[PDB]
Protein backbone atom coordinates (compact mmCIF):
# COMPACT_ATOMS: atom_id res chain seq x y z
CA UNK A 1 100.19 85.24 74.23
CA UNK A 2 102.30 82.38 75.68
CA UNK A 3 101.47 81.45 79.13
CA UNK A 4 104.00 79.90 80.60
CA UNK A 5 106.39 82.47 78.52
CA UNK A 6 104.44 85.05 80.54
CA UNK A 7 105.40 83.67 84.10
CA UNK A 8 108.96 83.68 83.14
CA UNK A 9 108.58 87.63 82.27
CA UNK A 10 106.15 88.23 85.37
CA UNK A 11 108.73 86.67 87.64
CA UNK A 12 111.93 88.83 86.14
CA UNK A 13 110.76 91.83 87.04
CA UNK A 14 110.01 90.72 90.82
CA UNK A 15 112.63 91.23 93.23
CA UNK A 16 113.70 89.83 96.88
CA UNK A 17 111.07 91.33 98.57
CA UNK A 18 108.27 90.73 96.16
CA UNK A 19 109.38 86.89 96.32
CA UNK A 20 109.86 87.26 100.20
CA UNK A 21 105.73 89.08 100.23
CA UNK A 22 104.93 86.92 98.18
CA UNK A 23 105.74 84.01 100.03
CA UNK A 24 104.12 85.14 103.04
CA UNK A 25 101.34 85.40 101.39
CA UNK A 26 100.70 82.11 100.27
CA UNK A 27 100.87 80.40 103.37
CA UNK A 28 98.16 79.33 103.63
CA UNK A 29 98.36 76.92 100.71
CA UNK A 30 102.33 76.64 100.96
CA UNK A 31 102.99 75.51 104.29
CA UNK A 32 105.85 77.53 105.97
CA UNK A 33 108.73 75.27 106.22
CA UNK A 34 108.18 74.19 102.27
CA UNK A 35 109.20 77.24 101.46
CA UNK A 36 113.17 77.01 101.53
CA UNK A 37 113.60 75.49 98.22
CA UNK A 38 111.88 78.36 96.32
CA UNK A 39 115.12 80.82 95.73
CA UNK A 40 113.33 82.89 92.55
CA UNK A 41 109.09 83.74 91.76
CA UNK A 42 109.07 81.30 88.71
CA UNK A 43 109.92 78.25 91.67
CA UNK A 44 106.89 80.13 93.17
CA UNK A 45 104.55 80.20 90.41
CA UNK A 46 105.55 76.73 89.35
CA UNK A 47 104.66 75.25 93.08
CA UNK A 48 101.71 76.59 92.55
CA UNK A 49 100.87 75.35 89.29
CA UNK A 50 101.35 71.66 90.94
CA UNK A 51 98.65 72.89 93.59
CA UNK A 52 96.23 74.02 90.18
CA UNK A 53 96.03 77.07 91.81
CA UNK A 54 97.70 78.63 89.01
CA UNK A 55 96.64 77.31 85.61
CA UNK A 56 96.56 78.93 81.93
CA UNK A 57 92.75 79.40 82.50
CA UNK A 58 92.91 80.13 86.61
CA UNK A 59 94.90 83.61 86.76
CA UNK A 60 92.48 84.33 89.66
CA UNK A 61 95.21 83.56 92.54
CA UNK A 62 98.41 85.51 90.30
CA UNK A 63 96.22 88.29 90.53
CA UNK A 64 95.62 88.30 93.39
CA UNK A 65 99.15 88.32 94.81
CA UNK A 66 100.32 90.50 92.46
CA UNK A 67 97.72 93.13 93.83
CA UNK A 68 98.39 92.61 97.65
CA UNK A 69 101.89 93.19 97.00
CA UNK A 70 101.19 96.61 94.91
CA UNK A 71 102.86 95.52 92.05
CA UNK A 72 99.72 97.19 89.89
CA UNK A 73 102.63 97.70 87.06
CA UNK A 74 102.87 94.09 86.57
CA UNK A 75 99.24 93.78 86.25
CA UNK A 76 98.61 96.00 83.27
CA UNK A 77 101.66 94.47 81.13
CA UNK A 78 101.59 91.39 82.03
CA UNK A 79 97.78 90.36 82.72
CA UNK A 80 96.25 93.44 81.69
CA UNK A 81 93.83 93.98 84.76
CA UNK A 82 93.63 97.34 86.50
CA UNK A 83 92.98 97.85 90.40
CA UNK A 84 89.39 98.79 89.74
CA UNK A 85 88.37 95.25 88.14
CA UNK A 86 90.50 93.87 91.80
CA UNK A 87 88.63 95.89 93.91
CA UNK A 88 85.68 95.45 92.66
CA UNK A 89 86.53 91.38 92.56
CA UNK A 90 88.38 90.69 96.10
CA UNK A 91 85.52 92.67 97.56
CA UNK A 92 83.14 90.55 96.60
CA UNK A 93 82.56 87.87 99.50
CA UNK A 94 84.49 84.48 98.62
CA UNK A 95 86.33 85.29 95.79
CA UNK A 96 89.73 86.07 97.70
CA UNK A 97 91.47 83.10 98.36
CA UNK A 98 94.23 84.72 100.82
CA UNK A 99 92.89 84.18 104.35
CA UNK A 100 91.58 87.64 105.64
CA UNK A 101 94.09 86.77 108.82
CA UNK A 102 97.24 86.82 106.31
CA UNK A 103 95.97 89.54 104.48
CA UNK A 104 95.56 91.31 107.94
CA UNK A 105 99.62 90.77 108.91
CA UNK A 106 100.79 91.76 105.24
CA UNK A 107 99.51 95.11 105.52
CA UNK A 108 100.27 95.82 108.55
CA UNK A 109 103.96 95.24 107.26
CA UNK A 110 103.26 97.44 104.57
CA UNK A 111 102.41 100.35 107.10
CA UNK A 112 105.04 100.09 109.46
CA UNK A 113 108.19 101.81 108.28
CA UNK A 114 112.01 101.65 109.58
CA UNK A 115 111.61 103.32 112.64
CA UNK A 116 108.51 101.60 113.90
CA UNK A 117 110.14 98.45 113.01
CA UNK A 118 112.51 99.08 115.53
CA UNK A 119 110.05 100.22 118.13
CA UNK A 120 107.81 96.52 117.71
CA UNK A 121 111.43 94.55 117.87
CA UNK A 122 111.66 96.29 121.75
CA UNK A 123 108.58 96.27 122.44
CA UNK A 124 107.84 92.56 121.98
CA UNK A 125 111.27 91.93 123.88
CA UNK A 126 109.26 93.44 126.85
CA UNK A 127 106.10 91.13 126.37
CA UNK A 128 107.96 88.07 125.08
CA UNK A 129 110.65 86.03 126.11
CA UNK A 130 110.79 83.32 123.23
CA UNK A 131 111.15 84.79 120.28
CA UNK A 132 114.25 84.77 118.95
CA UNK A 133 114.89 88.39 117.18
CA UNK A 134 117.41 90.16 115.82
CA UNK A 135 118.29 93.57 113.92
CA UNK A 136 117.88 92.53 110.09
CA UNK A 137 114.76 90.59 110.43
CA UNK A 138 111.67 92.21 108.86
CA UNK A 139 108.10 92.92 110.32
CA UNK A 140 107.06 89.89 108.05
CA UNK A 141 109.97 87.39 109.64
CA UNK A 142 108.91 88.68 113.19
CA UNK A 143 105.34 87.32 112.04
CA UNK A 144 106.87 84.17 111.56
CA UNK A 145 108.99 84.21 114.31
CA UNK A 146 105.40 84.92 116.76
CA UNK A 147 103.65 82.35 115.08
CA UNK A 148 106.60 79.36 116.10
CA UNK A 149 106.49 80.55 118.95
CA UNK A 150 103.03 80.15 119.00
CA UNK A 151 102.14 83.83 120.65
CA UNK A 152 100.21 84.61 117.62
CA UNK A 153 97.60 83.01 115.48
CA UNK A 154 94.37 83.45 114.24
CA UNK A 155 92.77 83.83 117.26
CA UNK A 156 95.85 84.68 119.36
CA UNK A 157 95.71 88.36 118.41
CA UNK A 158 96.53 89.61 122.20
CA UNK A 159 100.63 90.16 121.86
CA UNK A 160 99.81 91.58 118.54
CA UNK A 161 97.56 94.17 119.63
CA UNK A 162 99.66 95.26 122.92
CA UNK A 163 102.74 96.26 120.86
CA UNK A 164 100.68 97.60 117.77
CA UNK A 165 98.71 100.40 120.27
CA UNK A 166 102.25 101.10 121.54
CA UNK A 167 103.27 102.61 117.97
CA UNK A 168 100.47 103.43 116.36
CA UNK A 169 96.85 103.55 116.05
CA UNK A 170 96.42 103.03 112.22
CA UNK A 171 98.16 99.41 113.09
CA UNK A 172 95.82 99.17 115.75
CA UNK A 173 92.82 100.09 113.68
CA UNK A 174 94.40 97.18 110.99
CA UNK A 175 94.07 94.80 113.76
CA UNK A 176 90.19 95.42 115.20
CA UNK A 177 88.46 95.79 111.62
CA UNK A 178 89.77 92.48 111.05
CA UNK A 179 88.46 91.24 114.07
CA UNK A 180 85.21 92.52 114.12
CA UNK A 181 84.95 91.20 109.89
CA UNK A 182 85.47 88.16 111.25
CA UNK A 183 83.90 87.50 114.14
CA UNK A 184 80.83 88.73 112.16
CA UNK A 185 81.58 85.28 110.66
């Protein structure tokens, strides 16, 4: 089957927020503000074939987007893999290429749902003062919003984790297995 043929049909059946996750994801190989002239996933996949992170023999880094964003229906058809062969695979130490820190904010977007969205906006009003935030931004934009404004990081977790005990615990708990993985270093 026809690779770059294959990219094409991967990236029709992804929508706005697959190509918005997506993006977040890969920030840490697609710098932030480089990010504005990719409007569809092929732009996307294509960027990242000029990185040779994407390659007809290197599906390694397609995969694994494709399984942080849950779209396990695009990995059967498309690349015939199954979430068993990715868990087994991105739990194996160094084979994930996303930074555990990115993978870390992703799903605790993924958790958070409409009304707890609203809850972080107010609470990081109280804590913060330079963020600029309004009603139709995302958990994901907020992320990006914190990290301009330099009040969150890698190792700037402490904003973070002040609003995230105020909703809920299972955000919490996101927060402090990551940071005990990884100060186990």
């Amino acid at each position: 089957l026809d690779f770059s043929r294959n990219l094409y049909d991967i990236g029709e059946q992804l929508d706005s927020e697959d190509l918005a996750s997506l993006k977040f994801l890969s920030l840490d190989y697609i710098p932030q503000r480089k990010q504005e002239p990719i409007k569809d996933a092929l732009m996307l996949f294509q960027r990242l074939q000029e990185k040779r992170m994407l390659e007809e023999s290197n599906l390694s880094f397609l995969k694994e987007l494709l399984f942080r964003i849950n779209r396990l229906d695009l990995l059967i058809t498309y690349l015939n893999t199954r979430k068993e062969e990715m868990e087994r695979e991105l739990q194996t130490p160094g084979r994930a290429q996303i930074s555990a820190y990115r993978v870390m904010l992703y799903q605790i977007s993924e958790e958070v749902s409409r009304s707890e969205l609203r809850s972080f906006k107010a609470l990081l009003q109280e804590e913060d003062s330079k963020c600029k935030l309004d009603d139709d931004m995302n958990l994901l934009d907020i992320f990006i919003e914190m990290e301009k404004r330099v009040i969150l990081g890698e190792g700037k977790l402490d904003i973070l984790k002040r609003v995230c005990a105020q909703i809920n615990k299972s955000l919490l708990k996101i927060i402090n297995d990551y940071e005990e993985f990884s100060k186990e270093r």
